[PDB]
Design an enzyme around this catalytic site. Structure first.
Site, PDB file in Angstrom:
ATOM      1  N   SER A 196     -52.339 -31.197  27.922  1.00 31.91           N
ATOM      2  CA  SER A 196     -51.692 -30.360  26.894  1.00 31.91           C
ATOM      3  C   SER A 196     -52.077 -28.859  26.981  1.00 31.91           C
ATOM      4  O   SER A 196     -51.254 -28.018  26.664  1.00 31.91           O
ATOM      5  CB  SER A 196     -51.977 -30.926  25.490  1.00 31.91           C
ATOM      6  OG  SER A 196     -53.386 -31.001  25.268  1.00 31.91           O
ATOM      7  N   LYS A 220     -60.689 -32.165  34.358  1.00 36.40           N
ATOM      8  CA  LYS A 220     -59.697 -31.610  33.459  1.00 36.40           C
ATOM      9  C   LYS A 220     -60.020 -30.153  33.160  1.00 36.40           C
ATOM     10  O   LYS A 220     -61.050 -29.856  32.578  1.00 36.40           O
ATOM     11  CB  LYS A 220     -59.677 -32.400  32.177  1.00 36.40           C
ATOM     12  CG  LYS A 220     -58.354 -32.260  31.500  1.00 36.40           C
ATOM     13  CD  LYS A 220     -58.471 -32.366  30.016  1.00 36.40           C
ATOM     14  CE  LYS A 220     -58.259 -33.730  29.473  1.00 36.40           C
ATOM     15  NZ  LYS A 220     -58.956 -33.982  28.160  1.00 36.40           N
ATOM     16  N   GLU A 254     -65.501 -39.821  35.851  1.00 39.43           N
ATOM     17  CA  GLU A 254     -65.119 -40.849  36.837  1.00 39.43           C
ATOM     18  C   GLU A 254     -63.617 -41.190  36.843  1.00 39.43           C
ATOM     19  O   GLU A 254     -63.018 -41.486  35.799  1.00 39.43           O
ATOM     20  CB  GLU A 254     -65.800 -42.163  36.522  1.00 39.43           C
ATOM     21  CG  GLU A 254     -67.238 -42.267  36.946  1.00 39.43           C
ATOM     22  CD  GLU A 254     -67.810 -43.642  36.556  1.00 39.43           C
ATOM     23  OE1 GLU A 254     -67.470 -44.224  35.461  1.00 39.43           O
ATOM     24  OE2 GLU A 254     -68.620 -44.118  37.378  1.00 39.43           O
ATOM     25  N   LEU A 255     -63.049 -41.217  38.024  1.00 38.79           N
ATOM     26  CA  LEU A 255     -61.673 -41.644  38.227  1.00 38.79           C
ATOM     27  C   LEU A 255     -61.544 -43.121  37.832  1.00 38.79           C
ATOM     28  O   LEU A 255     -62.439 -43.918  38.108  1.00 38.79           O
ATOM     29  CB  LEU A 255     -61.365 -41.431  39.687  1.00 38.79           C
ATOM     30  CG  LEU A 255     -59.920 -41.532  40.068  1.00 38.79           C
ATOM     31  CD1 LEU A 255     -59.177 -40.293  39.599  1.00 38.79           C
ATOM     32  CD2 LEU A 255     -59.750 -41.818  41.544  1.00 38.79           C
ATOM     33  N   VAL A 256     -60.465 -43.486  37.149  1.00 36.82           N
ATOM     34  CA  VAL A 256     -60.206 -44.937  36.847  1.00 36.82           C
ATOM     35  C   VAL A 256     -59.008 -45.490  37.650  1.00 36.82           C
ATOM     36  O   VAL A 256     -57.975 -44.821  37.848  1.00 36.82           O
ATOM     37  CB  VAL A 256     -59.975 -45.262  35.333  1.00 36.82           C
ATOM     38  CG1 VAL A 256     -61.029 -44.620  34.413  1.00 36.82           C
ATOM     39  CG2 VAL A 256     -58.614 -44.833  34.883  1.00 36.82           C
ATOM     40  N   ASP A 310     -53.710 -41.075  16.801  1.00 36.71           N
ATOM     41  CA  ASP A 310     -52.520 -40.982  17.647  1.00 36.71           C
ATOM     42  C   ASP A 310     -52.586 -41.893  18.905  1.00 36.71           C
ATOM     43  O   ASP A 310     -52.405 -41.443  20.043  1.00 36.71           O
ATOM     44  CB  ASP A 310     -52.252 -39.491  17.955  1.00 36.71           C
ATOM     45  CG  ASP A 310     -51.911 -38.657  16.631  1.00 36.71           C
ATOM     46  OD1 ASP A 310     -51.183 -39.210  15.758  1.00 36.71           O
ATOM     47  OD2 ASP A 310     -52.383 -37.478  16.449  1.00 36.71           O
ATOM     48  N   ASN A 356     -52.327 -43.476  27.369  1.00 30.18           N
ATOM     49  CA  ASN A 356     -53.819 -43.350  27.570  1.00 30.18           C
ATOM     50  C   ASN A 356     -54.626 -44.629  27.726  1.00 30.18           C
ATOM     51  O   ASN A 356     -55.857 -44.581  27.680  1.00 30.18           O
ATOM     52  CB  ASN A 356     -54.378 -42.483  26.478  1.00 30.18           C
ATOM     53  CG  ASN A 356     -53.759 -41.102  26.503  1.00 30.18           C
ATOM     54  OD1 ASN A 356     -53.425 -40.563  25.445  1.00 30.18           O
ATOM     55  ND2 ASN A 356     -53.547 -40.530  27.740  1.00 30.18           N
ATOM     56  N   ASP A 401     -59.033 -40.081  26.799  1.00 30.43           N
ATOM     57  CA  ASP A 401     -58.647 -38.983  25.928  1.00 30.43           C
ATOM     58  C   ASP A 401     -59.366 -39.140  24.584  1.00 30.43           C
ATOM     59  O   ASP A 401     -58.850 -39.644  23.632  1.00 30.43           O
ATOM     60  CB  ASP A 401     -57.110 -38.784  25.766  1.00 30.43           C
ATOM     61  CG  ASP A 401     -56.729 -37.509  24.865  1.00 30.43           C
ATOM     62  OD1 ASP A 401     -57.597 -36.605  24.663  1.00 30.43           O
ATOM     63  OD2 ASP A 401     -55.563 -37.392  24.384  1.00 30.43           O
TER      64      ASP A 401
HETATM   65  N1  LIG Z   1     -60.641 -40.482  34.637  1.00 20.78           N
HETATM   66  C1  LIG Z   1     -59.319 -40.428  34.918  1.00 20.78           C
HETATM   67  N2  LIG Z   1     -58.747 -41.255  35.851  1.00 20.78           N
HETATM   68  C2  LIG Z   1     -57.412 -41.217  36.144  1.00 20.78           C
HETATM   69  N3  LIG Z   1     -56.577 -40.367  35.505  1.00 20.78           N
HETATM   70  C3  LIG Z   1     -57.031 -39.493  34.562  1.00 20.78           C
HETATM   71  C4  LIG Z   1     -58.457 -39.456  34.201  1.00 20.78           C
HETATM   72  N4  LIG Z   1     -58.624 -38.525  33.216  1.00 20.78           N
HETATM   73  C5  LIG Z   1     -57.367 -37.972  33.019  1.00 20.78           C
HETATM   74  N5  LIG Z   1     -56.419 -38.558  33.814  1.00 20.78           N
HETATM   75  C6  LIG Z   1     -54.919 -38.310  33.873  1.00 20.78           C
HETATM   76  O1  LIG Z   1     -54.582 -37.072  33.252  1.00 20.78           O
HETATM   77  C7  LIG Z   1     -53.778 -37.309  32.052  1.00 20.78           C
HETATM   78  C8  LIG Z   1     -54.115 -36.300  30.953  1.00 20.78           C
HETATM   79  O2  LIG Z   1     -55.515 -36.365  30.590  1.00 20.78           O
HETATM   80  P1  LIG Z   1     -55.946 -36.344  29.024  1.00 20.78           P
HETATM   81  O3  LIG Z   1     -57.481 -36.476  29.037  1.00 20.78           O
HETATM   82  O4  LIG Z   1     -55.110 -37.475  28.479  1.00 20.78           O
HETATM   83  O5  LIG Z   1     -55.325 -34.860  28.615  1.00 20.78           O
HETATM   84  P2  LIG Z   1     -54.516 -34.437  27.234  1.00 20.78           P
HETATM   85  O6  LIG Z   1     -54.273 -32.949  27.175  1.00 20.78           O
HETATM   86  O7  LIG Z   1     -55.271 -35.015  25.997  1.00 20.78           O
HETATM   87  N6  LIG Z   1     -52.933 -35.194  27.267  1.00 20.78           N
HETATM   88  P3  LIG Z   1     -52.665 -36.640  26.290  1.00 20.78           P
HETATM   89  O8  LIG Z   1     -53.669 -37.720  26.648  1.00 20.78           O
HETATM   90  O9  LIG Z   1     -51.297 -37.026  26.843  1.00 20.78           O
HETATM   91  O10 LIG Z   1     -52.916 -36.156  24.838  1.00 20.78           O
HETATM   92  C9  LIG Z   1     -54.058 -38.755  31.696  1.00 20.78           C
HETATM   93  O11 LIG Z   1     -53.144 -39.313  30.750  1.00 20.78           O
HETATM   94  C10 LIG Z   1     -54.086 -39.376  33.102  1.00 20.78           C
HETATM   95  O12 LIG Z   1     -52.727 -39.620  33.589  1.00 20.78           O
END
Ligand SMILES: Nc1ncnc2c1ncn2[C@@H]1O[C@H](COP(=O)(O)OP(=O)(O)NP(=O)(O)O)[C@@H](O)[C@H]1O
Length: 384
Positions: free
Chosen positions: A80, A98, A186-188, A228, A233, A247
Site C-alpha cells: 500500500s 518490504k 522470511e519468505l513463505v 480487516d 494475506n 501483514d
Molecule cells: N514473507 C513473505 N513471503 C511471500 N510473500 C510476501 C511476504 N511478505 C509480503 N509478501 C507479498 O507482498 C504482499 C504485500 O505485503 P503486505 O505485508 O501484505 O503489504 P501491505 O501494504 O499491508 N498490503 P495488504 O496486505 O494487501 O494490506 C503480500 O500480500 C504478498 O503477496
C-alpha cells in the site's frame, strides 16, 4: 473514464479509504466506484530503484548490500505504501523486504486532501460535504500503517501466540534488515487464498474451519487481533498443509470492555434473542438507541445471520447464507456521519467477524459452527 490514474498517485490513502468503507462490491455503493477502487488495488504503479535505495541507504547504512548474496531489482508485489523485493541473505536464507516509498508519513495530509478532492469533484461524497470524522480516522490509520517498528513488534508477538501451532504460522522477522521504513521477513511458500477456489471442498472447508476458530480466539482469548481479515494475506502450502499469516499492520489490541460486550452480542444472537442484541449493541455504543427503525432492523438482521451459524448443528452454507449481500448491514456506513460516531473498536469487531464470514463465503466452505462457538464462550467464562 480514468479517475484511476489520479487515485494511483495517492494509492495508500485510496486503499485505506476502500478498507474503511467496503468498496467491496457491496449491494448499495455505486458499482462504478468499487470498480475503480479494484482497478486501483491491482495497479502495480512502480517506482525507480533510486527511490527504494534512498529508503535502504537512509535506514540501513551503506553496509547493507554486504548481508546479501542477491537483491532482486524488480519488486514481486506492491504494498500500500511501497514495494516488496525478494533477496537472499549471505548463507542462502530467502527473505521478503518490504520497503516504503520515501517520505510517506510526511505526505499523509497532502495525499488525503487530494483524494477527498478527487472524490468531491466526481461527487461521491455523498453526504455532500467533507466528512470531518472520517478524514481524521483515515489520517490516524495511515500513520499507524507507516510505522514498521510497530508492525515488527506485532508480528513478533503474533509469532509467540502461534508457537508450535499445527496449522498456522508467522514468518520470522529478520531484525538486522528491519528498521522504521523497511520490514524484512522470511519468505513463505504456498499461494494466497485468492488463487485457491480451485482446491477441493475438503481442503477449503478445513482452511476456513481453521480461520474461523482462529478468529474466535483472536476476539475472545488473545489480547491481539488482525483487523480487516483478507484472503490475500493467508498463504496456503499444499505440501505442508499449513497457512502462513501476513501483514501485521492490521494488528490491534483493544480494551477488554468492548470484547466483553461483543461476546454478549454474539451469545444473544446464537440464542436468537434480538432484544439482548440490540441492548448490548447500544451499551457498546455502536447504536445510539434512536436510529430509524428500518436501518436498525437491517443491522439486527445481519447480526442474527451470524447467530444462525453459531445456533445450528447443521453445517452452514457460507456461500449462499453469508454473502456480502446477506451481511453488509453489520456495518451500516451511515453511522460514521453522526454527532458522536461509534468508537472505532466497534467497527473493528464487526469487520473482524464479518470479514471472516466472507472469506468462508468466497471459498464456498461448508461446516458446523456451534461447537466452536460454545467452546469459545465456555473458556471465556472459565477465565472469570
Ligand atoms: N514473507 C513473505 N513471503 C511471500 N510473500 C510476501 C511476504 N511478505 C509480503 N509478501 C507479498 O507482498 C504482499 C504485500 O505485503 P503486505 O505485508 O501484505 O503489504 P501491505 O501494504 O499491508 N498490503 P495488504 O496486505 O494487501 O494490506 C503480500 O500480500 C504478498 O503477496
Amino acid at each position: 473514464e480514468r479517475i484511476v490514474r489520479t487515485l494511483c498517485k495517492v494509492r495508500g490513502a485510496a486503499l485505506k479509504l476502500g478498507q474503511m468503507l467496503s468498496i467491496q462490491d457491496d449491494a448499495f455503493i455505486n458499482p462504478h466506484l468499487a470498480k475503480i477502487f479494484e482497478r486501483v488495488r491491482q495497479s502495480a504503479d512502480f517506482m525507480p530503484l533510486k527511490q527504494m535505495m534512498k529508503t535502504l541507504n537512509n535506514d540501513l547504512g551503506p553496509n547493507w548490500r554486504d548481508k546479501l548474496e542477491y537483491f532482486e531489482e524488480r519488486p514481486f508485489a506492491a504494498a500500500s505504501i511501497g514495494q516488496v523485493h525478494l533477496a537472499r541473505m549471505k548463507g542462502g536464507r530467502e527473505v521478503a523486504m518490504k520497503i516504503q516509498y520515501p517520505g510517506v508519513a510526511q505526505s499523509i495530509n497532502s495525499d488525503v486532501n487530494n483524494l477527498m478532492a478527487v472524490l468531491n469533484m466526481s461527487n461521491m461524497l455523498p453526504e455532500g460535504l467533507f466528512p470531518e470524522h472520517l478524514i481524521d480516522v483515515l489520517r490516524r490509520e495511515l500513520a499507524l500503517e507507516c510505522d514498521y517498528q510497530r508492525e515488527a513488534a506485532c508480528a513478533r508477538k503474533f509469532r509467540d501466540l502461534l508457537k508450535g501451532h499445527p496449522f498456522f504460522y508467522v514468518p520470522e522477522i529478520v531484525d538486522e534488515l528491519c528498521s522504521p521504513h523497511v520490514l524484512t521477513t522470511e519468505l513463505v511458500s504456498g499461494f494466497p487464498l485468492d488463487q485457491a477456489e480451485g482446491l477441493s471442498q475438503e481442503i477449503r472447508n478445513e482452511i476456513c474451519y481453521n480461520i474461523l476458530v482462529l478468529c474466535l480466539r483472536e476476539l475472545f482469548e488473545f489480547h491481539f487481533m488482525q483487523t480487516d481479515p483478507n484472503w490475500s494475506n493467508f498463504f496456503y502450502d499444499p505440501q505442508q498443509h499449513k497457512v502462513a499469516l501476513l501483514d501485521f499492520g492490521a494488528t490491534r489490541e483493544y480494551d477488554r470492555s468492548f470484547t466483553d460486550l461483543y461476546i454478549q452480542i454474539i451469545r444473544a444472537a446464537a440464542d436468537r434473542d434480538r432484544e439482548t442484541v440490540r441492548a448490548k449493541s447500544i451499551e457498546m455504543k455502536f447504536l445510539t438507541g434512536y436510529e430509524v427503525k428500518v436501518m436498525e432492523d437491517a443491522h439486527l438482521d445481519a447480526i442474527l445471520i451470524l447467530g444462525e451459524a453459531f445456533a445450528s448443528d447443521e453445517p452452514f452454507d457460507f456461500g449462499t447464507q453469508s454473502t456480502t449481500e446477506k451481511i453488509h448491514n453489520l456495518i451500516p456506513v451511515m453511522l460514521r456521519h453522526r454527532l458522536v460516531p461509534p468508537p472505532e473498536e466497534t467497527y473493528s469487531l464487526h469487520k473482524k467477524m464479518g470479514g471472516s464470514f466472507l472469506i468462508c463465503s468466497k471459498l464456498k466452505a461448508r461446516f458446523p459452527c456451534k461447537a466452536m462457538f460454545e467452546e469459545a464462550y465456555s473458556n471465556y467464562c472459565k477465565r472469570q
